[PDB]
């Protein structure tokens, strides 16, 4: 299906892109699992060191979206033949990340 884009904000981050577009207001066998195991895809030899010279979490919490979500579904393989229709995402300010005041 053709993707002509859609924009729902024109006021948050990426407003510059929305204004340039002019969208007014809210109007809109090598695939075997082993091949991909990182023992068969990483030069781990370089690591070998030769002559070198819990009530709250103990470990850090990973990005659930990266660890779990299918971000691969936001890759645009063909601009004209885009399998689904992408929609504008609002800023979601994750508070799990430190270094953000709120």
């Amino acid at each position: 299906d053709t993707k002509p884009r859609v924009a729902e904000w024109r006021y948050g981050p990426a407003r510059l892109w929305y204004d340039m577009l002019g969208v007014p207001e809210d109007g809109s066998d090598l695939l075997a699992d082993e091949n991909f195991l990182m023992v068969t895809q990483l030069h781990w030899e370089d690591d070998i060191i030769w002559d070198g010279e819990p009530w709250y979490s103990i470990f850090p919490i990973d990005n659930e979206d990266l660890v779990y979500g299918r971000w691969e579904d936001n890759i645009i393989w063909d601009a004209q033949a885009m399998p689904r229709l992408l929609e504008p995402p609002v800023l979601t300010l994750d508070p799990n990340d430190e270094n953000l005041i709120l």
Binding site: K3, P4, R5, G12, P13, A14, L16, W17, Y18, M20, L21, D29, L30, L31, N35, F36, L37, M38, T40, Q41, L42, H43, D62, N63, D65, L66, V67, G69, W71, E72, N74, I75, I76, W77, D78, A79, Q80, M82, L86, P88, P89, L91, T92, L93, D94, N96, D97, N99, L100, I101, L102
Partner: protein
């Protein structure tokens, strides 16, 4: 859509103002299709005085000119300055609306302030158009939230990377790469970059995509900010710059090819710095590249992007992904050494794919073969990859001599 009439229950209410106790429902239907028929004949004859006397408002003197036309007696008292008031009466089961008329002492109409005297009709001439456009005379028509500091910094930094000049862009990228406190503005930059790479589908601008990829490359070089929480947004943007098929406005002359190897180097860096066994970034990137490459029907641009990313990942990846499908080079040279259509755009992309393939497979052939390599090219596909491998062995010997 349908013939709309006054409700039949509005005629039972009217018939009890008369004194008629019980009126059957076939009589009420007989009343309301006649009175709503005579309303539509004075609605449409008032509209003939609104149109012939050019007004577009339908004042109440239009209906009074139409009741005069249908011989029916006029309705007295509808030229005074009034509006539409209604007053709700709840009651013990009888729901209605009325007027609630008010009174006024008679000496307060004898002693009202009189309005100002009207003016007589006069004429006025003015030019509307003088051999062209209208003059500009007054008788014509006239024609969590970022603080202001970092809001201004976000505005200046994003508008410096849109392409007005190159020097402000280089200073903005050297700002992004080398400032200590740019957190709290990282989600805005990630949203800006991902939406801007998405806006390539409406306008296939190669230049703005090169600028956004240099923005990502500058964001990666910042030591202070950690992109671990926002990498799920920047990965598919760089992936879109790699494996999409139309990266150009004019496909033949635009070097989409460089935004390909630049973004491939970028994604190799983004899965070197951030791939953890909980993340599975690199395995999930190799799987997308692999099923885009092995699958047929894919265009030569997206196959170029897949081969470029896979070959920037490292040596063992091109050992176990690229080297099984070296026979695909024959399927490529099917359309290069012998094509029925020569003037199409498949040939430049095909021999770009060929050049990238043999450039990246020359050190892989130098790693896993004999030192002689006498007829390895003949044993190779098309006998060209083997010549490139001989050139690569010569280059390695030259590097050893330099060492």
């Amino acid at each position: 859509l349908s013939n709309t009439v006054l409700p039949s229950e509005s005629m039972k209410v009217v018939a009890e103002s008369m004194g008629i106790a019980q009126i059957q429902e076939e009589t009420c239907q007989l009343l309301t299709d006649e009175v709503s028929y005579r309303i539509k004949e004075i609605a449409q004859d008032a509209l003939k005085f609104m149109h012939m006397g050019k007004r577009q408002k339908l004042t109440t003197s239009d209906i009074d000119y139409a009741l005069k036309l249908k011989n029916v007696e006029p309705l007295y008292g509808f030229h005074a300055q009034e509006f539409i008031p209604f007053r709700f009466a709840s009651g013990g089961g009888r729901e209605l609306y009325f007027y609630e008329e008010k009174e006024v002492d008679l000496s307060d109409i004898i002693n009202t302030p009189l309005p100002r005297v009207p003016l007589d009709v006069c004429l006025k001439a003015h030019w509307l158009s003088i051999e062209g456009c209208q003059p500009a005379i007054p008788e014509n028509p006239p024609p969590h939230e970022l603080s202001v500091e970092q809001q201004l910094y976000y505005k200046e930094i994003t508008e410096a990377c849109v392409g007005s000049c190159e020097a402000k862009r280089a200073e903005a990228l050297q700002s992004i790469a080398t400032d200590p406190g740019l957190y709290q503005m990282l989600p805005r930059f990630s949203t800006f970059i991902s939406e801007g790479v998405r806006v390539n589908v409406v306008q296939n601008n190669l230049a703005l995509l090169i600028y956004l990829m240099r923005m990502v490359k500058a964001l990666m070089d910042n030591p202070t900010l950690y992109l671990e929480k926002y990498v799920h947004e920047l990965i598919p943007a760089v992936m879109t710059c790699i494996v999409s098929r139309q990266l150009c406005l004019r496909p033949d002359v635009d070097n989409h090819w460089a935004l390909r190897d630049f973004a491939a180097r970028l994604v190799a860096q983004i899965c070197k710095h951030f791939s953890t066994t909980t993340n599975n970034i690199q395995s999930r990137i190799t799987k997308t590249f692999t099923k885009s490459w092995v699958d047929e029907k894919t265009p030569w641009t997206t196959r170029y992007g897949s081969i470029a990313g896979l070959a920037e990942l490292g040596h063992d990846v091109i050992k176990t992904l690229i080297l099984p499908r070296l026979q695909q080079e024959g399927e490529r040279i099917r359309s290069v050494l012998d094509g029925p259509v020569l003037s199409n755009i498949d040939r430049i992309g095909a021999d770009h794919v060929q050049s990238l393939l043999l450039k990246h497979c020359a050190p892989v052939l130098a790693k896993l073969r004999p030192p002689p390599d006498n007829q390895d090219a003949y044993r190779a596909e098309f006998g060209s990859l083997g010549p490139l491998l001989c050139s690569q062995v010569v280059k390695a010997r030259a590097q050893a001599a330099l060492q």
